Symmetry: C5
Subunit: 204 residues, 5 copies
């Protein structure tokens, strides 16, 4: 229940411990989800964008940037990666969905669909997560690694417990996002830890 409309989290330096915890009362394992957000970073090294771990389970749901032009999704430790043409540095809008019944993962980058990949067909993502921005978890809520830290700005984050169709992804990118039931930027419960500053969104 904070409205972050028009605002970003700024992670202004590299560190082991600067991060934001995102709080959701998620009790039911996820069969389907979509996650969208905008990010702006001038790192060239690898970094985590969104880290969701559960007790005893590393990389339960992880969105990770390998290198320029390459986005990975981990589900239950397993991973897929898809490629895109992108400028560097540049702001980006990222959406990723995953559907247990097919295993299909869909990345959409600036409203453009990447090649579909598939993993973990039939699996359910475990509930009661710890969700972190700014660092990559290796434990339940911690064991960070500064070489995977996100330095830069993140905004307009939403997470739904369904697979959004293309029209709803384009709405998030450049229209009005559909209100979201797991995490929603207009009513976000978060905890800042360390050096993270909230500022207006000034980039597109």
């Amino acid at each position: 229940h904070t409205d972050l409309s028009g605002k970003v989290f700024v992670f202004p330096r590299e560190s082991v411990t600067d991060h934001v915890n995102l709080i959701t009362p998620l009790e039911k394992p996820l069969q389907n989800f979509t996650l969208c957000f905008r990010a702006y970073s001038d790192l060239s090294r690898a970094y985590s964008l969104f880290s969701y771990n559960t007790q005893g389970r590393d990389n339960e749901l992880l969105v990770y940037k390998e290198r320029v032009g390459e986005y990975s999704l981990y589900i239950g430790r397993h991973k897929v990666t898809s490629k895109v043409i992108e400028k560097f540095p540049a702001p980006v809008h990222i959406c990723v969905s995953w559907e247990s019944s097919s295993g299909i993962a869909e990345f959409w980058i600036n409203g453009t669909p990447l090649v579909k990949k598939g993993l973990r067909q039939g699996y359910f993502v475990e509930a009661q997560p710890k969700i972190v921005l700014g660092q990559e978890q290796d434990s339940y809520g911690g064991k960070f690694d500064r070489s995977q830290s996100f330095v830069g700005e993140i905004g307009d984050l939403y997470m739904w417990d369904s697979v959004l169709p293309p029209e709803n992804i384009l709405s998030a990118y450049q229209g009005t996002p559909l209100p979201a039931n797991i995490l929603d930027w207009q009513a976000l419960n978060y905890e800042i830890r360390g050096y993270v500053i909230i500022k207006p969104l000034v980039w597109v």
Copy 2:
């Protein structure tokens, strides 16, 4: 048969097992043909796009992507290769025709003609094929190779027993193909084996 209008086959992972068999009652050897389809892959390694083998004959008709910008056609184990400027990764529309009487093979990539090449003048492509998407055959229906597997999405596949003129290739590129008498995406007889998922086409 099945009308896959608006849908693609998704080969969501690298494997030696995942494939689609395409069924056609082709009993008479082929003198002329055109094959068109759309594909979207972010593989950089080589892969097979369309594998047609007959009893005792490898690479009887094979469309093979050597590397970015380079397309090969095999007829009766002989090959030609032509080059094109293309972005990577990117969706592509591919048409290729071959005419026994001249030996001429014509690739068209996104409605643009590649340099003509020639092979197997006077040859007849044998009938009673096994036709596979997703893997390259080295036997009659099998002996796949993971390093040649196709990972990504294929749709809008049509095959004619004649050489299409430019206007009919552009029609196919634009999404209004002429009726096709060997394989037709709107009345396709196929078998999924392994991990292949049918999804809507979202990238055209």
Copy 3:
């Protein structure tokens, strides 16, 4: 004798044998000429575009492609080379003229003039040629070299016994050449030898 309007010669493979002889009743040594044609090849190695030899004289008039972006004209074994920015692979329209009185050679690529060069001022190109497409001659009509063979398509070839002014070069580039009196694609006397196929021009 044959009107090849709308048609190309296709040299569909690398060889030391495949060629076209162009026949013209040229009995008087040439003081001035312009030669225009369209070509489409995806070779990266060097190749001959137009080979004119006379008895006892190799490289009497030769248009040669050194590498991407570089065009050479030989007159009586001496050469000039001019450079241009071009895409690869791409169709190209090439015009070259030479004027004995000044020695000036003008290349025009896709209707744009290259830097003028000069050679053989005062020379007359010898008459009674053998003129070959598809191979580079080292004798009077023969002694070909596979490594200089042209693979690809040639069309719209015209040769005048004068130096065309710019607006006449542009007319030829646009597909409306002024009347040509040495070689004329719309009334061409030729001989196919080996594997050369006439097909419609589909890339203009």
Copy 4:
């Protein structure tokens, strides 16, 4: 006391001597500032753009160009660097702001925001500066280094004791800057030392 509208300082050669002192009446420590200026240089090596040293303190506020596409701000010897896509050589409009309360530094290059970075949260930039263009100070007003000298043109320099919002940054980029209370190009007190020439600005 001088309106330099429409004019630039030209540092026409590499040297360890040529520089401009900028004189400001500011006597209180700075908690917030914005600095904007336009520069045109064809140096590839690193160079100082704006050097603000105070007695006893090197690099108290320093704007430094590491290499093409990379801009650094030093505050009290600590630094941040942000990246941008830019052509070389090219004129550039540079703005940078810093806010003590958050430590946030914002670079804007040709009206486009770079990724925010943070340093020196809670710090006060010392007053009674010597402010130098053309050279990088290693002492209070001197100790220059030829290899960090600025060669080229600088104009349209303004410095405010506040953090400008995006609209006011864009106004400056577009040529209608707000009046500026630390340094103002339209009412500037300066001292030329060595070879620095004032000329009309011809490159906007």
Copy 5:
């Protein structure tokens, strides 16, 4: 006394001999000048564009192309160099001015200003030159060097005994120069030596 409107000098081959002498009747030292001309060359090696030597003084005023994108001016044996983004090969319009009082040299390439540089403040360029196109002088009228020779085309050359403001530079670039008093293409006194041919300007 010759009007070369619409014509160029073509230096069609590398040599240590081919050149044009340009003769001015204005006999006076130069405190200010501007020189404009068009050039088209596909050399990659260094070459002289305009060579002005006086008795016993080499490199008294020299415009020299170091390599792609780099232009140098020598005044009295001292030099400056400025860089520009340009295509290769490409026609170019070059203007350069120099002002003794400030030492400032201004290059303009296709109507766009390069970074100003400065040299020889207070010097007077000596009177009674030999002015050569096509070769770089090392003596008064001679001692050429084939590795510095200009191959290609030069036209629309004008030289004024003043520093042109930007609007007059743009007029020259656009083909409507102000009449010029040191050298003027519409009333030029020149001597061709060796192989230099006058042809129409076809590349503007």
